[PDB]
């Protein structure tokens, strides 16, 4: 019904963007870890939202109904 992979756009507090190519079944903790590493901040200092809802570590794009080029927002925790 859908592809195996998805591109997600992560928008940070300063409006900058990093895009991620993610398998639909990957736990989104992996995206949180990579994003925090690129920003040089502790992962625990950030919260990641999709459609205004907190993304859990074990949430996957498939579970959340994410689609190509959907936005994840990053706010300070």
């Amino acid at each position: 019904k859908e592809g195996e992979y998805i591109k997600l756009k992560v928008i940070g507090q300063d409006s900058s963007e990093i895009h991620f190519k993610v398998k639909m079944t990957t736990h989104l903790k992996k995206l949180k870890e990579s994003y925090a590493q690129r920003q040089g901040v502790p992962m625990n200092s950030l919260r990641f939202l999709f459609e205004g809802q907190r993304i859990a570590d074990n949430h996957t794009p498939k579970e959340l109904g994410m689609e190509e080029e959907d936005v994840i927002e990053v706010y300070q925790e």
Partner: peptide, 8 residues
């Protein structure tokens, strides 16, 4: 610059 990261 566009930034695309491949996640495993």
């Amino acid at each position: 610059e566009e930034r695309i990261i491949s996640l495993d």
